[PDB]
Amino acid sequence: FSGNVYALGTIGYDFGDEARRDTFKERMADPYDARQMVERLDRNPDEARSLIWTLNLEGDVIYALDPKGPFATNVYEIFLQMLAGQLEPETSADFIERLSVPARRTTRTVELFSGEVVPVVNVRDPRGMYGWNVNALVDAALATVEYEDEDSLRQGLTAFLNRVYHDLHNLGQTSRDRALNFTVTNTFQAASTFAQAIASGRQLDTIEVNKSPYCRLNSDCWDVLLTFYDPEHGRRSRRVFRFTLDVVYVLPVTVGSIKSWSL
Amino acid sequence: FSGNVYALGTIGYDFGDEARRDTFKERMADPYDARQMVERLDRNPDEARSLIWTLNLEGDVIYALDPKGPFATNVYEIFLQMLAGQLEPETSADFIERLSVPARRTTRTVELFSGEVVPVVNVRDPRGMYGWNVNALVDAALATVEYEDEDSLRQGLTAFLNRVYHDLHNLGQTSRDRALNFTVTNTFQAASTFAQAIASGRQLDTIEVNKSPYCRLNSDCWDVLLTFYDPEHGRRSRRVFRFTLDVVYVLPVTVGSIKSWSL
Ligand SMILES: [Zn+2]
Ligand SMILES: [Zn+2]
């Protein structure tokens, strides 16, 4: 055990070398066309093992993803599902533009076709691997609040979810870094919780992350505070949301319910 | 000379102590209502000198702003203009949600009412101090391209400009950090340049910032590369934008025109 990783980004594939590239050049017109590769791998699942699967954060290849154990086949299936979803029209229910990947660290690295050497992490099974698109999260959020305003509320929720992602996304190795990446996951999953806040005419002000006093010993718990405010209307109370995250586990967990109160 | 600062964020004010707070409690119903303070200071400009003016990045008070020199009055006027714009309805032409502040470092600090001690920076005159709102930038961008699609293009441009801000915003002290903050400024100002890219169905992939070989000695130049790609449609060329920024000056400058080419 070399520690855990909790990473966000973009899934991709890499041929590693020219021999593997050539193998796939014979199997479709253009193996660099990911649409064609998705089709090929969907028809021939075992060929997925012949690629290097990568996690990419805003153009930086940060990890190679190695499925191992009895659920490797299951994991390859999710890899393909995520690859395919990224290629969908932005209006598709299966569209994917956000991704979470929990993994175990190793001391293994792999060389990409480019010559770059990236660290390998073990993805043992599909649990905790999520793919989202922002529009779908916003629609879920809108369903829980009363209004028209919808266009304004939709754009406010969109801007909130995107801000949280870009403010926090990171390499996902240290405890704090895993906590910040998992904060994004938790914010996405609990999007509707913040909808009344945005609908009330508030917007995110601060994100604060502290080591939590609320967990058992030998946990790795962090308290995350999101505070919302209204810049336009005088003295108005600030709304705080708190949740507690335990990242000691390779599958991080939320501890208790999301708390909220005014200041 | 202790170096330069190039900072982004939110302008605010602070009373420093209870005596100064009380002075303003007698001058309006509620001095914590920034709307009331804007009104008071617009009618009584010299009272602005009695406040601590702050720059705030996502809830962290990062600097106290000290206007000095023969243009201090001019600078206080801009402070007020920025404070007022932040309070406008989001639909107002004068709405402000993004801010750039160039300044000279000092070795002076000031204590805020809360007891926090923050570094003071000197803002000598209004040059290079910009206030934007994203919607207005997007409207400018849309004016230069052909379409309908507008709703889709508007949201794509919005997401781009917001991503760049949250990806890059920082404390703004080191050369690299000033370069990244100024990249945001330059991206905003040159928003229309990226509009064809987004209209073509591409989106930002990577931001890369390197020390530039294209400037004179004793400059502090950085090359910024923004690469755009289309995740949906097969093999399609990537579009690169490059510009060169010199942050040696307290007012950073762009060097040459923005370059663009395909890969
Ligand atoms: Zn980002
Ligand atoms: Zn941000």
Author numbering:
A (entry chain A), B (entry chain A): 920 to 1067, 1070 to 1184
What's the publication's text?
Patellamides are members of the cyanobactin family of ribosomally synthesized and post-translationally modified cyclic peptide natural products, many of which, including some patellamides, are biologically active. Patellamides originate from a longer precursor peptide, which is modified by a series of post-translational modifying (PTM) enzymes to yield the final cyclic product. The two domains of unknown function (DUFs) are homologous to each other and are found at the C-termini of the multi-domain proteins PatA and PatG. The DUF domain is conserved in all patellamide-like cyanobactin biosynthetic pathways characterized to date, suggesting it may play a functional role.
To gain some insight into the DUF domain, we have determined the crystal structure of PatG-DUFsp. to a resolution of 1.72 Å, and using isothermal titration calorimetry (ITC) and nuclear magnetic resonance spectroscopy (NMR) we have probed its binding to some plausible substrates: the precursor peptide and intermediates formed during biosynthesis. The absence of PatG-DUF homologues in the PDB required the generation of a SeMet PatG-DUFsp. derivative, and the crystal structure was solved using single-wavelength anomalous dispersion. The structure has a fold comprising seven α-helices and 13 β-strands. The refined model contains residues 920–1064 and 1077–1184 (the residue numbers correspond to full-length PatG). The missing residues are at the N- and C-termini of the model and in a connecting loop between α-helices 5 and 6, and are presumed to be disordered. The Zn2+ ion is coordinated in a tetrahedral arrangement by residues Glu977, His1087 and His1090. Since zinc was not deliberately added to any of the purification buffers or crystallization conditions, it is presumed the Zn2+ ion was bound during protein expression.
